[PDB]
Design a protein around this ligand. Sequence first.
Ligand SMILES: [Zn+2]
Length: 66
Amino acid sequence: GSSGSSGLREAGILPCGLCGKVFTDANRLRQHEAQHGVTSLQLGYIDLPPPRLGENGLPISGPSSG
Ligand SMILES: [Zn+2]
């Protein structure tokens, strides 16, 4: 005697626990999850962030003050 796969497709609909949105259709929420990246990497969108934060042009010993 042991269980297996006897029943129905009972998943469970719930509101997006990442941004705070609410969904009713599993298929609809499945797409929204992509926006965040739930175990996936959704790319193709346009992005143009600022340049990295770094600099150069300094000595090796530094200033001798103290
Ligand atoms: Zn969300």
